Amino acid sequence: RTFFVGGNWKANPKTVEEAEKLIEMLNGAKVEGNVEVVVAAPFIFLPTLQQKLRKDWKVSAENVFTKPNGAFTGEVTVPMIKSFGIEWTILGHSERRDILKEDDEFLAAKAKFALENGMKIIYCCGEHLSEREAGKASEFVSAQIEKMIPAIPAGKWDDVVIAYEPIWAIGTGKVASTQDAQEMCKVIRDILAAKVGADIANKVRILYGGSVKPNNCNELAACPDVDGFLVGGASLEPGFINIVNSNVHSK
Amino acid sequence: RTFFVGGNWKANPKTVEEAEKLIEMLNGAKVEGNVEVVVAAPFIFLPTLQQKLRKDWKVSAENVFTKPNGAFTGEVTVPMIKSFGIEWTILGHSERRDILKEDDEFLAAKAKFALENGMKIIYCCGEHLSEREAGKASEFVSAQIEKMIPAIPAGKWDDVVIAYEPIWAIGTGKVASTQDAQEMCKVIRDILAAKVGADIANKVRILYGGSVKPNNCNELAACPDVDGFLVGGASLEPGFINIVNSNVHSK
Ligand code: NA
Numbered sequence A, B: 001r002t003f004f005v006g007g008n009w010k011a012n013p014k015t016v017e018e019a020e021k022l023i024e025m026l027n028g029a030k031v032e033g034n035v036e037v038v039v040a041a042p043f044i045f046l047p048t049l050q051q052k053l054r055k056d057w058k059v060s061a062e063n064v065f066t067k068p069n070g071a072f073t074g075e076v077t078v079p080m081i082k083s084f085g086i087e088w089t090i091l092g093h094s095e096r097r098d099i100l101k102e103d104d105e106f107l108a109a110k111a112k113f114a115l116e117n118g119m120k121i122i123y124c125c126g127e128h129l130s131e132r133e134a135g136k137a138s139e140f141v142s143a144q145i146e147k148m149i150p151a152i153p154a155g156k157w158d159d160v161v162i163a164y165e166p167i168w169a170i171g172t173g174k175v176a177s178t179q180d181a182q183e184m185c186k187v188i189r190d191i192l193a194a195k196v197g198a199d200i201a202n203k204v205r206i207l208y209g210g211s212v213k214p215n216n217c218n219e220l221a222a223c224p225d226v227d228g229f230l231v232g233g234a235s236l237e238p239g240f241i242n243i244v245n246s247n248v249h250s251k
């Protein structure tokens, strides 16, 4: 599997000038090894990013709606994004599940619609502190992945990447270990193997989407079931390049 | 009060090429009378629209989040929009209240944040069929406006426009009359007068946001408390210009 690093800018930066400065820094970065890099930005910066970002990387949206167009004030749709040449979106990020109240049925509909219309997706999952403490993390994540699975159209698993977010380690006073990352990525791979088969399980990239920084990326990358990262705040910093380059530690 | 016409494209068109064609048609339109025109488009088309739209009109977003930036994957914020020179947003559109489940507390926070950061807002309200049939439309709309009022910072009423949406007439099998539009716009003006005073009530534009087309815009415009329109589907059509030009029938 090719190592995969997604930079999720989230709702940042504040201005188009700052976005352009960030792009200039990314464009001069020396990538080592073999890695697929995707950069996700706010909708209003996607045109800028598509025009100016180095063409060996790809641009991603941070969300999409479930329909092609229509009476959905405020929503951006798959055809609009595709009309700029953008091929990727994030779906189901913890912030959207938890703050914007996106449920599994809505997310499954987004995944199906995006894939059947020629997008590729970074589909996010992960458990909260209660389920982690109860020893039920794998049950919780399995339910999420089992809702995603029937949404994937026939022939579209090549266009799916899954990101695991240790939500129990966000703003809770608890920190995730390297071993926690490996264990949960392996749990997801085994669910795929059991539900859709070994061929698919062996090709799908499974990313760690917890806190990834230059000081932990190399050890995380070396974990056998960790195929890359969905990076948060370091995306906006020169340290993103260190994370991209951690691929050389992943066998 | 200057007559005000907002074109809400909603989640349309599907492609940037179609957006550019629509802009070209708007740029050649001959406006009659005196009218303030704003065009609201999907986030990803806002840069295009800001660059290319006739400078005597203004661009608007269709929504904004409550914070300047941060860990809000998928959201677009006020500073991002302002960094393109865009000064307007719609808030509280029925589609966002009803499909995206935006509540009055969230919307009040958006209105306060947008206004205190130098935006102007088109704040939407309106009752559903049950409240209309119960004879409680004015109570329902008053509760909505009373949640909006304390959000408006001192000195910012010049930057507020209110749109009334007869949600009871959307997809219900019932149609609104011209008299219904006038009556509800007057209800809103009287709430403003009673709660924040006659000076403010006399300056705030109150728009009709139900079905507005070339065949009904002139009679609606003539209603004394109707100060313009938040236009839906006709926004995407040459008939938008007829609606803009209905201002000559409003005294
Ligand atoms: Na257990």
Ligand code: NA
Pocket (backbone or CB within 6 Å): A220, A221, A222, A223, A224, A225, A226, A227, A228, A249, A250, A251
């Ligand atoms: Na690895």
Ligand code: NA
Pocket (backbone or CB within 6 Å): B134, B135, B136, B137
């Ligand atoms: Na009554």
Ligand code: NA
Pocket (backbone or CB within 6 Å): B220, B221, B222, B223, B224, B225, B226, B227, B228, B249, B250, B251
């Ligand atoms: Na009028």
